[PDB]
Each structure stands twice: as C-alpha cells, then as structure tokens.
Amino acid sequence: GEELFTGVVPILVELDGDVNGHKFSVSGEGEGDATYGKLTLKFICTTGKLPVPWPTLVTTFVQCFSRYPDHMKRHDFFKSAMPEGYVQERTISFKDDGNYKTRAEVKFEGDTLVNRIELKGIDFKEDGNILGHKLEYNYNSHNVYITADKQKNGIKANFKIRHNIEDGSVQLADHYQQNTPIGDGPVLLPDNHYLSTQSKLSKDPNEKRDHMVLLEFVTAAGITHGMDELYK
C-alpha cells in the first residue's frame, strides 16, 4: 500500500465539468513524491477557455501523496486504500454564490496514479466572482483536519478555503469531503489529525492553451505529544 509510494509516481488527472450550462474538460499530468509530500502538476483545459477561475479547482484536482511522518504511519488512510483506490466526494459552497458537487475516483492504473473527476456547478451568479473571473491567480496555505468515519469505512473533512478577490476581499469556499475505499481490503482508519498544505500557481510561458501549473507540498501533522516526550 504505502510501498507503492516510495519513489516518484506519475499522475494523471481527468475532469469533466458542467458549470451553469458551460461544459468543459481538463487533463492534468505530473508526478508525486510522497516522501517529500511534493506534487508537480500541469493542467490544460481541453475544451477551450475555463469557465471558472483556475484557483477554484485546485482542491478538486490526490492526498495519497501527503507526507505522513514515520510516527504517523498508522493514520495514512489514503495510501492504505491503494492500489484499488478510494472515492472522494465533495460539496464546495461559495459564500454568496453557487456550489460545486464533485465525485472522483483515485486509483492506480499500472504505475500511474489516476484522479478521475466529475464536477457539477449550480446556482452561480453570472456576474459573480466565479463566473466573472474576479479571483486573484494565487493560493493560500491551509490546515485540513481529517476524521474517521467508522460506519462508512472511510474519512471525512470540512474546511474553508480563502480565495483572494480583485477588490481586496476574501471569498470563502466551504468544503465538505467524504472518502471511502473502492476495494474491500481493510484500510487504516486514522486518529484525528490534519494535513498542512501549501500551493503555488504559475504559468507555462510556452503553453498556448488555457492552463495552470501547480506546485504543492502537503505534510500530515498534529500527533505530537508522544514525540515531544522523547526530548524532555
């Protein structure tokens, strides 16, 4: 399970979306190195111009690449579900605007880790920050808290992403997330903890299609009192 992530793993991301009548598709490719919690991914809109801002799709576009420190090995649900994979479902509610409903399956196809996503967008304002592309092209860091879900054999998370807006304000995107294994093999159900994420957005100067370059680092954290005792 975890042994599938000891080296660099090629990643493929595929999303099909429909946001207020606008149908679109995105393909992403890169690689993950879970030993450093490092993701390098480049996304291309294969249907033309993206109808929503790129930053709003960052969370939707593979937490199995998070760095789980050795003392937290027993809490890494995402890798324990591999190679069969897990389903990741989200609702993302944008304050004073519409919402996304996403469903993804993340699993290995051979050596490639594949994230296949369906996105539906509803009730957006045609003049709002999303459909109006009024978000800044950047991304803040966040701590995502993970909890187990015994009765559904998986985990859940909820967190509020802060998106910077052109006019100086901040647009909150409230995420509710649920992950469940695809396989029937047992998986690690974690103790409460969090994932510390940082993301940098950039552009490829040679890319003519609408696109996003993403560099991301994720580390699991929060289980500390045991280690701290060693240094008293």
Residue numbers in the entry: 4 to 64, 68 to 238
Task: Quote the paper.
Chromophore formation of green fluorescent protein (GFP) is a built-in type of posttranslational modification, i.e., the chromophore of GFP forms by an autocatalytic reaction of the backbone involving cyclization, oxidation, and dehydration reactions. For recombinant expression and purification of green fluorescent protein (GFP), one of the variants of GFP, GFPuv, was used in this study. Here, we demonstrated that the second posttranslational modification is generated at the side chain of the C-terminal Lys238 residue of the GFPuv, a mutant of GFP, when over-expressed in E. coli BL21 (DE3) pLysS strain. We determined the crystal structures of GFPuv form I and form II at 1.65 Å and 1.28 Å resolution, respectively.
The species with a higher mobility was named GFPuv form I, and that with a lower mobility was named GFPuv form II. The differences in the observed mass of form I and the theoretical one for GFPuv were quite small, and its isotope pattern was also similar to that of the theoretical mass spectrum. GFPuv form I was eluted at a lower salt concentration (~158 mM) than form II (~180 mM), which suggested that GFPuv form I and form II have a difference in their surface charges. The pI values of form I and form II were estimated as 5.76 and 5.64, respectively. The overall structures of GFPuv form I and form II are almost identical when these are superposed, showing 0.145 Å rmsd for Cα atoms of 233 residues, though slight differences arise mainly in the conformations of the turns consisting of Asn23–Gly24 and Asp155–Lys158. The C-terminal α-helices of GFPuv form I and form II also show almost the same structure in each other, except for the slight differences in the side chains of the C-terminal residue and the adjacent Glu235, where the electron densities at the end of the substituent groups in form II are more disordered than those in form I. The regions around the chromophore of both forms show almost the same structure, although the alternative conformers of the side chains of His148 and Thr203 could be modeled in GFPuv form I and form II, respectively. These observations support the fact that there is no large difference in the fluorescence characteristics between GFPuv form I and form II. Therefore, we concluded that the majority of native GFP exist as an unmodified form in the jellyfish photogenic organ in terms of the C-terminal residue.
